[PDB]
Design a protein around this ligand. Structure first.
Ligand SMILES: Nc1ncnc2c1ncn2[C@@H]1O[C@H](COP(=O)(O)OP(=O)(O)OP(=O)(O)O)[C@@H](O)[C@H]1O
Ligand SMILES: C/C1=C/C(=O)O[C@@H]2C[C@@H](CC[C@H](C)/C=C\CC1)O[C@@](O)([C@@H]1CSC(=O)N1)C2
Ligand SMILES: [Mg+2]
Lengths: 24, 361
């Protein structure tokens, strides 16, 4: 619960993900 | 108070965000009389199943009968949860790769038929990942109607690498009917299918080594188990206990050419960015009722270990409540303060239309 929130808060954007080739 | 509704091919799971378990769980069915109410929904159809023709509005995880689905949702809100939908933000779930037009129609129905103040549509596999406390990993979700392998990075499903397998729990029940019939016990009718589903859930398991387990079954009767029908009559089940879910690893058992779930897991990872592959291998999460077989996680560990690079850290996570991990993940997610900015509001819908589901969800 507390664990998930932090990773969700630090969740990179759809653009910032494409930059690292991970997201189409 | 936010609502969470997981719309399964087989079962609807519904409740309130912040609760540990779904308040309501009922069959995803609408039934109509075979002979001279006009229709019965969910548990109401179940209780009169003998006199009704049943229809499943959700097929392989995708809503295909919208009128019947509206009945399901109505029954969920009013009969099951006893709430007024206009008083509650509502989180719905969808299958991986659900078409945009489907999710737009879901959004439209929620705002326009049920008048919800706000809503959101989340991917089932993603919610299960979250429930396990992770935002990166690969989820195997095997339910009643469909099985998906969904690689997820930082909350994002990676659509190019998703695998769909049209083999899931219902097919496995059907297969068990067939091989029990070959054994000498006729299971052929619609009511008998429910009985065999119960047998499957009670007695089936996944062999660690299929050939060895078959050898044991042939050499002694220690793997044999008796099962008592509702009328007191008894049958025996032998190697069918493990031959049934072996189909997951060997789809050819029901004449499918597809790769088994171990191979689909491997294939999925190998389609992802090179630098995230080890993160997926270390975070293989099982979800859905069809991953409930005793032995399944150890068998997955074995088969994937054989396929993966020999030094790869492989980990299979199989949470005890994984029948409901999709719902649980939705409950967690919808109750995060940091999530309240994610909802699609009525005001946001009114100005943008159903297509806002593309931008917000
Ligand atoms: N202990 C068990 N062992 C084997 N199978 C089980 C067990 N418990 C439930 N199942 C099966 O899991 C299926 C239901 O699971 P689940 O509720 O995750 O499906 P659904 O979400 O309604 O389906 P879908 O996600 O494919 O649209 C049923 O086929 C059921 O028989
Ligand atoms: C006990 C619970 C099991 C479930 O998974 O049920 C769902 C929904 C159900 C709908 C018809 C049934 C008569 C109604 C209630 C069963 C609900 O069909 C299923 O049993 C189907 C038929 S058999 C197969 O294994 N899945 C799955
Ligand atoms: Mg499901």
């Amino acid at each position: 619960k507390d664990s998930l929130a932090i990773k969700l808060s630090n969740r990179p954007s759809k653009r910032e993900l494409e930059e690292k080739n991970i997201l189409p | 108070t936010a609502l969470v509704c997981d719309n399964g091919s087989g079962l609807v799971k519904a409740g309130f965000a912040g609760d540990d378990a779904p308040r309501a769980v009922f069959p995803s069915i609408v039934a109509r009389p075979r002979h001279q109410k006009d229709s019965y929904v969910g548990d109401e159809a179940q209780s009169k199943r003998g006199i009704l023709t049943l229809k499943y509005p959700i097929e392989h995880g995708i809503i295909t009968n919208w009128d019947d689905m509206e009945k399901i949702w109505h029954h969920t809100f009013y009969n099951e949860l006893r709430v007024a939908p206009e008083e509650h933000p509502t989180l719905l779930t969808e299958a991986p790769l659900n078409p945009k037009a489907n999710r737009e129609k879901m959004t439209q129905i929620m705002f326009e038929t049920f008048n919800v103040p706000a809503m959101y549509v989340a991917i089932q596999a993603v919610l299960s990942l979250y429930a396990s406390g992770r935002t990166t990993g690969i989820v195997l979700d095997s339910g009643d109607g469909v099985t998906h392998n969904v690689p997820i990075y930082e909350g994002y499903a990676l659509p190019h690498a998703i695998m769909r397998l049209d083999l899931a729990g219902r097919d496995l029940t059907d297969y068990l009917m067939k091989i029990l019939t070959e054994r000498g016990y006729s299971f052929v009718t619609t009511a008998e299918r429910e009985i065999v589903r119960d047998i499957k859930e009670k007695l089936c398991y996944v062999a660690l080594d299929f050939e060895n387990e078959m050898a044991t079954a042939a050499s002694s009767s220690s793997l044999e188990k008796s099962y008592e029908l509702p009328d007191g009559q008894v049958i025996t089940i032998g190697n069918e206990r493990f031959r049934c879910p072996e189909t997951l690893f060997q789809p050819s058992f029901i004449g499918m050419e597809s790769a088994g779930i171990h191979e689909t897991t491997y294939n999925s990872i190998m389609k992802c960015d090179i630098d995230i592959r080890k993160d997926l291998y270390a975070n293989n999460v099982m979800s859905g009722g069809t991953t409930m077989y005793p032995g399944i996680a150890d068998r997955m560990q074995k088969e994937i270990t054989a396929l993966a690079p020999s030094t790869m850290k492989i980990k299979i996570i199989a949470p005890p409540e994984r029948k409901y991990s999709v719902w649980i993940g939705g409950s967690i997610l919808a109750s995060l303060s940091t999530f309240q900015q994610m909802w699609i509001t009525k005001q946001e819908y009114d100005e943008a239309g159903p297509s806002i589901v593309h931008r917000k969800c």
